[PDB]
């Protein structure tokens, strides 16, 4: 039926994907959101810091970059919240993340983790 290849059938990549927080299937959604948010905010703080309009002025490039990354994390959190509200409206085991309450807790955890990751990336450059 479907096409099987070593890229999608290797046990190493399957274990790597299963080790990711999104494919844990059994932990609290807020913890998953916190982990994903931290991992995303830490990498997100970089481009705004090194390439923004205030990248050449000293003592404020990191400030502006971190604030921009924080705003982006806030926008992504709002996107996650509206996605959860418009996706789960009615109706192994079923993952609790794919539910209204689960996705709302996931979005809140993502917001907290993203802001913490941005703040940690800002102090890591000092």
């Amino acid at each position: 039926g479907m096409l099987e290849t070593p890229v999608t059938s290797a046990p190493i990549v399957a274990t790597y994907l299963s080790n990711l927080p999104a494919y844990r299937t059994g932990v609290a959604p807020v913890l998953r959101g916190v982990e994903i948010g931290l991992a995303h905010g830490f990498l997100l703080a970089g481009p705004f810091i090194k390439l923004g309009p205030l990248r050449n002025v000293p003592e404020t490039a990191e400030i502006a970059g971190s604030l921009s990354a924080a705003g982006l994390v806030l926008i992504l959190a709002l996107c996650l919240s509206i996605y959860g509200s418009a996706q789960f409206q009615s109706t192994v085991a079923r993952d609790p993340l794919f539910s209204a309450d689960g996705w709302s807790e996931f979005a809140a955890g993502f917001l907290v983790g993203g802001e913490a990751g941005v703040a940690w990336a800002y102090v890591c450059t000092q």
Partner: protein, 198 residues
């Protein structure tokens, strides 16, 4: 059962089961039963925050401490960077524990205590008093910020200035006079608008 004006009608979803009901929902945002509980909890916590904030602002002007809109610029015995980190770290656990309380019980709580009442005067009448005082404090905080926006000075100072010349010192004689006058007239006409159509 008094309503939000002499002769209103409940919008079919504010029958009176909730405390402090007056049939006020023109935008009909509480049409969903699930959203009504969350909005009620949000109203209660906003009222509690406004109550504490209004009492704090009123107490600072009496003693002579800096104004509420300039207290942040004052230098304290700490760093603002560390203050924000501690504030979000404590509130993360506090808000997480408060949210889990609402999912199990449906009301507010402190830490691991859902019905937080060490003294024990949790009555049905006390719950409505909290809502009424919270609503009054929310309007009071909005008034504090608005008075500081156009007049500055302070809330107690604003009340003292109003007693000097009540007929000449008011919102109508201020910089936002015509806007609030037109809004007051439109609001006064509003109950007749709702009663004319029904």
């Amino acid at each position: 059962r008094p309503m939000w004006y002499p002769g209103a009608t409940a919008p079919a979803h504010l029958d009176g089961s909730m405390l402090g009901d007056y049939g006020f929902d023109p935008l009909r945002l509480g049409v969903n039963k699930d959203n009504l509980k969350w909005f009620r909890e949000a109203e209660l916590t906003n009222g509690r925050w406004a109550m504490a904030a209004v009492v704090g602002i009123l107490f600072t002007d009496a003693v002579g401490l800096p104004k509420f809109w300039t207290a942040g610029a004052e230098k304290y015995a700490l760093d603002n960077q560390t203050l924000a980190l501690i504030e979000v770290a404590v509130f993360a656990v506090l808000e997480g524990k408060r949210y889990e309380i609402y999912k199990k019980t449906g009301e507010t709580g402190f830490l691991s205590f859902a019905p937080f009442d060490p003294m024990g005067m949790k009555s049905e009448e006390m719950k409505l008093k909290e809502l009424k005082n919270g609503r009054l404090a929310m309007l009071a905080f909005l008034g504090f910020c608005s008075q500081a926006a156009v007049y500055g000075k302070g809330p107690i100072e604003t009340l003292q200035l109003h007693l000097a010349d009540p007929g000449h010192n008011n919102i109508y004689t201020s910089s936002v006079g015509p806007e609030t006058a037109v809004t007051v007239a439109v609001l006064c006409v509003l109950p007749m608008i709702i009663e004319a159509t029904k």
